[PDB]
Design an enzyme around this catalytic site. Structure first.
Site, PDB file in Angstrom:
ATOM      1  N   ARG A 164       7.770   0.416  -6.935  1.00  0.00           N
ATOM      2  CA  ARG A 164       9.150   0.920  -6.929  1.00  0.00           C
ATOM      3  C   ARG A 164      10.086   0.063  -6.085  1.00  0.00           C
ATOM      4  O   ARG A 164       9.662  -0.560  -5.113  1.00  0.00           O
ATOM      5  CB  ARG A 164       9.199   2.357  -6.395  1.00  0.00           C
ATOM      6  CG  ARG A 164       8.927   3.435  -7.432  1.00  0.00           C
ATOM      7  CD  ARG A 164       8.914   4.822  -6.784  1.00  0.00           C
ATOM      8  NE  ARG A 164       7.626   5.090  -6.157  1.00  0.00           N
ATOM      9  CZ  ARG A 164       7.307   6.206  -5.506  1.00  0.00           C
ATOM     10  NH1 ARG A 164       8.188   7.200  -5.375  1.00  0.00           N
ATOM     11  NH2 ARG A 164       6.089   6.325  -4.984  1.00  0.00           N
TER      12      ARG A 164
ATOM     13  N   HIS B 134       7.207  -4.368   0.420  1.00  0.00           N
ATOM     14  CA  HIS B 134       5.920  -3.791   0.095  1.00  0.00           C
ATOM     15  C   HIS B 134       4.837  -4.700   0.653  1.00  0.00           C
ATOM     16  O   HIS B 134       5.083  -5.879   0.935  1.00  0.00           O
ATOM     17  CB  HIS B 134       5.725  -3.629  -1.418  1.00  0.00           C
ATOM     18  CG  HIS B 134       6.536  -2.521  -2.020  1.00  0.00           C
ATOM     19  ND1 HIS B 134       6.322  -1.192  -1.725  1.00  0.00           N
ATOM     20  CD2 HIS B 134       7.541  -2.548  -2.928  1.00  0.00           C
ATOM     21  CE1 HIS B 134       7.177  -0.448  -2.409  1.00  0.00           C
ATOM     22  NE2 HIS B 134       7.918  -1.248  -3.160  1.00  0.00           N
ATOM     23  N   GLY B 135       3.634  -4.155   0.794  1.00  0.00           N
ATOM     24  CA  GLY B 135       2.478  -4.949   1.202  1.00  0.00           C
ATOM     25  C   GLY B 135       1.146  -4.302   0.867  1.00  0.00           C
ATOM     26  O   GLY B 135       1.091  -3.235   0.247  1.00  0.00           O
TER      27      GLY B 135
ATOM     28  N   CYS C 256       3.387  -1.419   3.760  1.00  0.00           N
ATOM     29  CA  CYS C 256       2.031  -0.864   3.698  1.00  0.00           C
ATOM     30  C   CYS C 256       1.039  -1.993   3.949  1.00  0.00           C
ATOM     31  O   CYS C 256       1.346  -3.170   3.736  1.00  0.00           O
ATOM     32  CB  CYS C 256       1.694  -0.226   2.340  1.00  0.00           C
ATOM     33  SG  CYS C 256       2.605   1.243   1.871  1.00  0.00           S
TER      34      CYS C 256
END
Lengths: 152, 90, 90, 152
Positions: free
Chosen positions: D36, D95-96, D138
């Site tokens: 997302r 994000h990660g 993350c």
């Protein structure tokens, strides 16, 4: 500032895993043919004992542990009742490599496999209490290079 | 009651950053453990916390050298501590 | 001159321990960055160092929850700092 | 106690890599089909800007960076002359997963590949000066479980 409660006597257990004799590693693990005994490691074990006894911890020394012996020792403390303690300390003195420490038998224990035994769910009587791990070992075979700076 | 993370309240004191060696003087002990003990014995009575103490250990060990290889050693703490950690003497 | 390690003087502030999620409130910002900024703005003028500040961030984020999953978040600093790190206002 | 010199104005650069739009990741990387957009990330970028400008850093924002763009930006600062600075800060909002952060294109950058660009040998004008990295991402898909404790 908030500070951890630190008033029980003993404060808690301070484990010392003190690995000196790597004869079994030299015997059984090909790549560790010439891994050396850790002469002088008793000087660290003694310094930690003096230091943490002075700070009111109960010292639990264990000399020359194989990986299975290390796991056996940690399981004992994972299942112990720490309700009357305010802290837990575990010191590992050994050879190591990237992310691991060696037993005297040259088997590998990943560091996070050791620490993860004492999470709140796995050891509820240490929930909310500091859990301290000191790892004296190499984490690979590279030399850390130096860089020039001005003297303080 | 209150809930905190499963992995809260840990301190991991590593003698070295990943991929590199740490050093042992066979007549004295290791750079990291001997520095740690000296700093603890000196600073805990002053009320200093463990992160301040481990910062000093980083300083002291950073000033040592392996003159055979021009090698250095860089300790590396990691923590999920939520409060100051002190070890009082009284 | 003096020599220190190649990897000295780093601070790595992670929003979460390895293997786990961190959280973002789309109307507010992330748990970690919003806590970090609040603590910095409050404590830097008091002369507090970054490790004391990140300890407070661990505390604050540890008290938050994801009520959909009963999820928590545990930030995790790692450091090779050799001195106190302060950000003065003057 | 020894304290890092922190008196230059600006103190140093504070990079903000602010990743919002992951359309390219959704398009090109099979497993990231439903990753997302990071709605609200601008609120973090703004908070960091306000906070570090107040603390006398020079803010360098970069929105919606692919992995190659991230490496391009870091190379610029690795090769920059920081002689007149006392500090360097790099903030990554993205994000990660385990040990990595994602570009908006869904390619991976290992975190230590980012930090290692600023070692003393690679960036001599930052030798002896604090280098600070804040990573908001993350680091995997597991939920961190809760444990019960007494209220402070």
């Amino acid at each position: 500032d908030k500070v951890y409660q630190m008033k029980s006597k003993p404060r808690g257990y301070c484990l010392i895993i003190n690995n000196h004799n790597f004869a079994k590693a030299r015997e059984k693990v090909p790549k560790l043919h010439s891994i050396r005994d850790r002469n002088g490691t008793h000087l660290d074990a003694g310094a930690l004992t003096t230091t943490f006894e002075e700070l009111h911890f109960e010292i639990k020394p264990h000399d020359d542990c194989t990986v299975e012996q290390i796991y056996e020792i940690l399981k004992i403390y994972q299942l112990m009742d720490h309700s009357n303690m305010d802290c837990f300390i575990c010191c590992i003195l050994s050879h190591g490599d990237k992310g691991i420490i060696y037993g005297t038998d040259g088997q590998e224990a990943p560091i996070y496999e050791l620490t993860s035994q004492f999470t709140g769910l796995k050891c509820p009587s240490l929930a909310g209490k500091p859990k301290v791990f000191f790892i004296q070992a190499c984490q690979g075979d590279n030399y850390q290079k130096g860089i020039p700076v001005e003297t303080d | 009651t209150r809930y905190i993370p499963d992995e809260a309240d840990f301190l991991l004191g590593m003698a070295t950053v990943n991929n590199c060696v740490s050093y042992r003087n066979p007549a004295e002990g290791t750079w990291y453990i001997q520095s740690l003990c000296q700093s603890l014995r000196e600073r805990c009575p002053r009320g200093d916390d463990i992160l301040t103490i481990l910062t000093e250990v980083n300083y002291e060990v950073s000033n040592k050298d392996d003159k055979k290889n021009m090698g250095k050693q860089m300790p590396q703490p990691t923590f999920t501590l939520r409060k100051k950690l002190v070890f009082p003497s009284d």
